[PDB]
Symmetry: D3
Subunit: 126 residues, 6 copies
């Protein structure tokens, strides 16, 4: 299952842009969250994307001009990230697969946590 030890969610992007994570399907009416994480790197950025406990849906898009791929764990495969909420990269909690899912209906209700959600660019010195 993605997010389990051994199946960690990583992203690789080129050029500047924002990776946005939508945290939703919260148990007992927990508020859904949307937050954009910017990079200004002109080259490659590597990222770790986390879940939040008590949520069952995680969707993300890349809005930069350059490529963006995900990798699961130490797997070799890198596959394109969604570029709009109508074709988001989405993970159902417990799933081993990233699917394409339209989550346009979820976004308007989410609270904004730009630069404070659970996706992180790795720096030059790690």
């Amino acid at each position: 299952a993605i997010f389990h030890t051994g199946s960690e969610l990583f992203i690789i992007t080129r050029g500047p842009g924002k990776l946005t994570l939508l945290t939703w399907g919260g148990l007992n009416n927990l508020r859904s969250v949307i937050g954009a994480i910017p990079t200004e790197n002109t080259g490659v950025t590597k990222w770790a994307v986390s879940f939040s406990h008590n949520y069952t849906r995680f969707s993300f898009i890349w809005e930069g001009q350059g490529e963006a791929c995900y990798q699961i764990g130490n797997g070799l495969t890198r596959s394109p990230v969604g570029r709009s909420w109508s074709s988001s990269s989405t993970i159902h909690w417990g799933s081993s697969t990233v699917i394409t899912e339209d989550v346009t209906s979820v976004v308007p209700g989410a609270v904004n946590r730009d630069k404070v959600t659970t996706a992180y660019a790795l720096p030059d010195n790690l």
Copy 2:
């Protein structure tokens, strides 16, 4: 503030062991979570540690025999991680500092989520 873009929480460890994260101070009666994340690496492991939305306290220890340090964002400083819950590394949500805090009183109430909490070892091919 730690966990914000630019102040991401990274760990560096040497040798095998477990990085254990206690997610607590939940809003809305949310159950606290404790989960150990194992590495079998004999060398250096780099890690990304995430918070979970709707929690206000994040405490972690390294249970392995080798060294463990944290780094904030692209900062150069690397400082020892706590090695027992009475001297845990702890972040109060909104703080820019990792403090040493006794959270022994929090641990027994937390639900166990070993290999499924918000701390991730980076692989050899990222």
Copy 3:
């Protein structure tokens, strides 16, 4: 087009095994070539795969327990390499895409150039 500057053919493998390249579709009645390139590396091996002038077909497989993907140029996508000649990774000279092609009919007549064909494991010190 693959093999042009900017669209170089790279491979990434995990663990020991052999990458085999089949050079065929020769102009001027050139004979077909097959050559296995082994690695004993336990971890990630990166590779450059070249064409030969005057040939129009390039087919390759990975034979190993571990994963194998190709990457084109500096692009972020990494996609699985074929694991038998009946579903080889194949490039038609001029194409920008790697296809799956059965080339089992080419193999028996190809001249064997094991450890002397146009696929190279990159070393630890480049």
Copy 4:
């Protein structure tokens, strides 16, 4: 022998310029090839240089302000590359050594395959 597994031909350059490969000594009247591969990198560029099957001579030069050295396999030594066709770096197919050879007489007959010959700059994300 250079181009065999363990004796792969690598180039290291500094700054922008062009690496040109001359593939010649073709069997069965195969036409000679000359092709320039440019880099605009301001720093170090690493390169893999391939032979083509059915050719017995491979000669290369670097045209740039900055240094250029070759390395054989995972060997440590790095030695200067020729900077003009009258003192080209040259490999006789079967040789374990890079020699200096004047191939000015070979150049005019070669077909031009600029940006489509068997020398490759390695990307930032391999």
Copy 5:
């Protein structure tokens, strides 16, 4: 003991500036040395700092806008370097610890060896 095999003195800096080493406590009235080593790197610079035989005191500071930390051997801890002689980073020959020590009274008597003392920025191609 710092400067023994396994306890080598390394520095990590960000941005341009000068690392200055003061070599003092010379046996048999050997002359004290002070020398500034500049970097113009915009990003991270890694450094090796050596002692000189027959000296018993080594003190250093970083003058630059960016961060500077030292690391002992392959240890994970990185700790801030002194930014003035009144709170220099200092090593007593035979000590395993870097201390803060005011050496302002040592500086004026030391002979100037700017760009020729025993502290070295590592290059991009090592």
Copy 6:
């Protein structure tokens, strides 16, 4: 001149062995030093070699089955290190060049400083 900023002395070795530094030519009858610095790395070790103030001669050898080369500053060239004191790599203080020199006559009078002289293996985490 080697050891000046921009012309730092770096070594690259493969496999386990010892790099031995002989510090001699001491002003005012300063005692000569010989010290072996071991590596147990199975692959590449990178090294920084320092002079000591008040000495005018620096000679080094590599004892191991694998290769050893030196590199000056950010230069691309890497050239073999001497493998015995009769064919030592030697630097005359102020020279821009490493020469081969027999220093067997200097060795017997040098004091032993094994694992405590001015040559440093770089760690896995720098």
